[PDB]
Structures are given as C-alpha cells and as structure tokens.
C-alpha cells in the first residue's frame, strides 16, 4: 500500500534487470518508471535514497547511482573456493547449499569441479552445509578399526577406573 507496497517492486524489478546482464547502474527516478511507481510519495523517495538503497547488501552505489552487487554473490568457481577459505580462516562457519545455488547459477559445475575441497554436511531437512576442506592434517583408518574404536566403550567408565588402567599395565 503506502510506504511498503512500493519499495518491494523496486528491489524485485532490480533483481530481474541484473539477470538480463545489465550491470549499468540505475537512478532512483529511472527505476520508478519501469516499476509503475511514478506516483510514489515524496518522503519515500528520500527514504529509499538515504536508507533502503544503501543499507541493503544487494545495492551498490556507483558514481552516485545504484547497481546490483554480483561481486559479493558467488558467480564463479574461484570465488566459491575463496569464500569458504575465508570462513575457515576467520572461523565464520559454513554456508547452506541453497544460499550458493541462488548466488551461483549452475552451481553444480563449480561444486563438482572443486571435488573433495568442499565438505558437505546434510541437515535433517536435507539441507547441505558447505565447509572448507582443510588439507593441512589428514588421517583416516579402515571401517574395521573405526567400528572397533566404537566397540571400546569409554563413557561407561569413571575417572578413577580410567586412570587406574595406566598403572595396571605399567605406563
């Protein structure tokens, strides 16, 4: 309606414009014409100019005009690898697979190209979380050893008994 039903179409229309490949920025008035919001309120023009078009993480202010932010979004295979590396280096955390698909068209090519470099963690809702594969220290054993490792129960022992075994065998 008023102050809410007009700003959204500006964002929605702008998103569609980028998909056409037009990286050129657009003015506040120019976007209004194509969004059929030429009659927008006067105090909405300044509010969008001062707050909406700067605070949003998808609006880039260029030479006084506004353009989409594809640089922040992952649109290349190299960017995908770099972003995960920063998350591990800075300990920011993983990213859901859905957040990358929308940002990276045909993300399957990039995900499969990197191969094992991406760690996929499947959530209960089938959502996959991507983490950087730190290849610094790697170690693995056969499933037989891992099953035997689980067969050695340890939560069922107290501290006194656990430490007693050390002197029992002489170590």
């Amino acid at each position: 309606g008023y102050k809410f039903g007009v700003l959204a179409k500006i964002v929605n229309y702008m998103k569609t414009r980028h998909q056409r490949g037009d990286t050129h920025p657009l003015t506040l008035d120019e976007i209004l014409d194509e969004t059929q919001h030429l009659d927008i309120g006067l105090k909405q023009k300044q509010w969008l100019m001062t707050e909406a078009l700067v605070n949003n993480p998808k609006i880039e202010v260029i030479d006084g005009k506004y353009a989409f932010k594809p640089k922040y979004n992952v649109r290349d295979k190299k960017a995908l690898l770099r972003l995960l590396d920063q998350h591990d280096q800075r300990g920011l955390g993983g990213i859901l697979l859905e957040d990358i698909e929308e940002a990276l068209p045909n993300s399957q090519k990039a995900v499969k190209a990197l191969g094992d470099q991406i760690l996929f963690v499947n959530r209960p809702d089938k959502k996959k979380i991507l983490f950087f594969n730190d290849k610094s220290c790697q170690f693995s054993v056969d499933e037989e050893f891992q099953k035997l490792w689980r067969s050695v129960t340890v939560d069922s022992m107290d501290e006194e008994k656990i430490e007693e075994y050390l002197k029992r065998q002489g170590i």
């Binding site: 920011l92 037989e144 891992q146």
Partner: protein
C-alpha cells in the same frame, strides 16, 4: 601452554573424530576459555549438534566445563557454560585409549590360538578343536555333527586368521607420530 600440547591434541582429534570435533578444538586453542554460546555463533552449528559434540568431548574428558551464574542487566538469571581444555587430564585419556589398543593387539595374538576351526555346514555352528573329538564318531571314522549327522569341515576357518596378522604391523606404523608426540609432552 607449550606448543607440544597444542599439536598433540590436534593430531589426535583429526584422526579419530569428525570435522565437527576438530573445529571446536581450534576455538579453544586460540583462546584459553570460550563460552559455549559464543562457540555456537562462530561455528553456526545446531544447538543439539553442538551439545552432542561437546558431550562426546566431555565424555572423553578432553575439555572441562565450569558454570558461572550472574544476574543480567535486565535482572533475569543467566547460566553460561564456559569450556576449557584440560591437557593434564587429556593426556591420560589419550594414553588410556592407546594402551587398550596395544593390549587389544596383544589379546589378538592369544585369540588366534583359541579360534574354533571345526564347523558343521548344515547348522552353521563352529566347534573348538578339543570339542571336535567329542563329536567324533568311531563308526564313521571322521568328524560329524550330532544335531545334523553331517560331516564337519575345518578349511573355512583358515582364511580369516591371516587377515588379523596384517593389521598388527600397520597399526604400529600409523601410530608412531602419536607416540613421538607423547614423549615430547612428558615435560
């Protein structure tokens, strides 16, 4: 915190635990003590998922937790869980988890001798060598099964015995780095 202790903990967590356990350890290495809530935001893990990993870490006593209670600015009670690494207790658990495997390896040597070789194909039951003569029927002049009255074979039990032997040599080789680290952490 000697650098040897930090490296020793990292080498073991990445070998017998998932990536989830290793990531939480790095936070406790950068800072001596870190809040459980703070760790959740950095790793972005689920509330239950983080607790499960912490419980497993607390189960093996690689890290200890202390509870601090204070009144918040708004007056509501606050219960923060502070986690920290106890190297003195951690080293004992690593030694305990290693000696048992070594003694288990020693046990494997004795198990090979007492393995039951005789087995009836019908009932698919394996009988010990000493028990084999018990079922021996003089009239037939060969081993038999009382339940099945069928011949008892022993060739099928030879193959699995050799597999355990190969694991002995490999286990001692892959574990040398852990033993070497332990010697460096004795001071």
């Amino acid at each position: 915190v000697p650098a040897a202790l930090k490296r020793l903990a990292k080498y073991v967590i990445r070998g017998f635990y998932g990536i989830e356990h290793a990531l939480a350890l790095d936070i406790l290495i950068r800072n001596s003590c870190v809040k459980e809530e703070d760790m959740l935001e950095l790793l972005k893990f689920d509330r239950k998922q983080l607790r499960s990993v912490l419980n497993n870490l607390k189960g093996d006593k690689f890290i200890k937790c202390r509870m601090r209670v204070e009144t918040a600015a708004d007056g509501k009670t606050t219960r923060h869980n502070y986690y920290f690494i106890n190297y003195r207790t951690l080293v004992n658990v690593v030694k305990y988890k290693l000696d048992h495997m070594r003694r288990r390896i020693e046990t494997d040597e004795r198990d090979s001798t007492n393995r039951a070789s005789f087995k009836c194909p019908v009932c698919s039951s394996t009988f010990t060598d000493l028990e084999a003569n018990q079922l021996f029927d003089p009239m037939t002049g060969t081993f038999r099964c009382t339940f099945c009255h069928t011949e008892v074979e022993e060739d099928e039990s030879a193959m699995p015995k050799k597999d355990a032997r190969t694991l002995l040599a490999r286990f001692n080789e892959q574990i040398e780095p852990i033993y070497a680290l332990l010697r460096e952490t004795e001071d």
